[PDB]
């Protein structure tokens, strides 16, 4: 064949694709795929949203120093941190992370999207985050998925210097957030932008439709979405390697 490598890798991805076990559920077997595609649509909508938000300097007033946000590391893990610095030219943010990468009891990264103002969904998929010694990490603005309303007053500068007075308030606030968390995302997009509102409306529609499903009420959806997710990734990779879809 004129394409040995392509064939090899394709065969591999196919095998790995069909070697996936799907656990049965009387609450997901009906509408879980739609939940998946709609979820990915939500994620994409958020990405584009952040892409359009970083354009207007108003974003600095949204991600002011000490802004609690939920981003994702290269491994698609959800982390909570504070906004320390923002760069418009590079579209990157210096976030101080106080939480380890959220992972299932299995060990694999959680692929579920965190929906603000969703007590049930939270309690079912995101029971609690584990605290970790804070460390500065740069992350692209596009990675941010949730922008909470809560903000850390004390300057992070003193926290970096490890001043006891600052570390007390930092630890207290952090433990406050982790003990009981009812994150609520509120963004004042009315300030500027036109496409922003459209993206917001569309995303809210996607959410209204996704919460209408039955898999959304599932207790163990966080573990049931894994196989479908992996199968999705592998599938897309296969279609690509096949030079298919033009
Ligand atoms: Zn289920």
UniProtKB/Swiss-Prot annotation:
It comes from the Eukaryota. It is found in: Cytoplasm. RNA helicase component of the SKI complex involved in 3'-mRNA degradation pathway. Represses dsRNA virus propagation by specifically blocking translation of viral mRNAs, perhaps recognizing the absence of CAP or poly(A). Essential for cell growth only in the presence of M1 replicon. Component of the SKI complex composed of at least SKI2, SKI3 and SKI8. The SKI complex interacts with SKI7, which makes the link between the SKI complex and the exosome in order to perform mRNA degradation. Belongs to the helicase family. SKI2 subfamily. Present with 5770 molecules/cell in log phase SD medium. This is Antiviral helicase SKI2. It comes from Saccharomyces cerevisiae (strain ATCC 204508 / S288c) (Baker's yeast). The lineage of its organism: Eukaryota, Fungi, Dikarya, Ascomycota, Saccharomycotina. The gene is SKI2. The chain holds residues 837 to 1082 of 1287 of the full protein.
């Amino acid at each position: 064949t004129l394409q040995p490598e392509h064939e090899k890798q394709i065969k591999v991805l196919q095998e790995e694709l069909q070697t996936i076990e799907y656990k049965s559920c009387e609450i997901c077997d009906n509408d879980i795929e739609k939940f998946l595609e709609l979820m990915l649509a939500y994620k994409e909508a958020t990405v584009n949203l952040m892409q359009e938000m970083v354009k207007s300097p108003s974003i600095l007033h949204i991600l002011k120093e000490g802004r609690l946000v939920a981003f994702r590391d290269p491994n698609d893990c959800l982390k909570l941190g504070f906004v320390f610095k923002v760069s418009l030219k590079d579209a990157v943010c210096v976030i101080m992370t106080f939480t380890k990468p959220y992972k299932l009891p299995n060990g694999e990264p959680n692929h579920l999207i965190y929906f603000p103002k969703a007590d049930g969904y939270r309690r079912r998929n995101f029971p609690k985050f584990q605290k970790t010694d804070f460390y500065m990490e740069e992350v692209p603005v596009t990675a941010i998925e949730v922008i909470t309303k809560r903000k850390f007053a004390a300057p992070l500068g003193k926290v970096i210097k490890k001043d006891v007075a600052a570390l007390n308030e930092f630890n207290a606030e952090t433990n406050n957030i982790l003990d009981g968390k009812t994150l609520k995302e509120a963004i004042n997009i009315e300030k500027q932008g036109l496409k922003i509102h459209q993206i917001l409306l569309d995303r809210t529609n996607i959410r209204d439709e996704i919460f209408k499903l039955k898999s959304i009420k599932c207790p163990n959806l966080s573990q049931h979405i894994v196989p479908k997710f992996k199968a999705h990734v592998i599938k897309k990779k296969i279609e690509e390697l096949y030079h298919l879809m033009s």
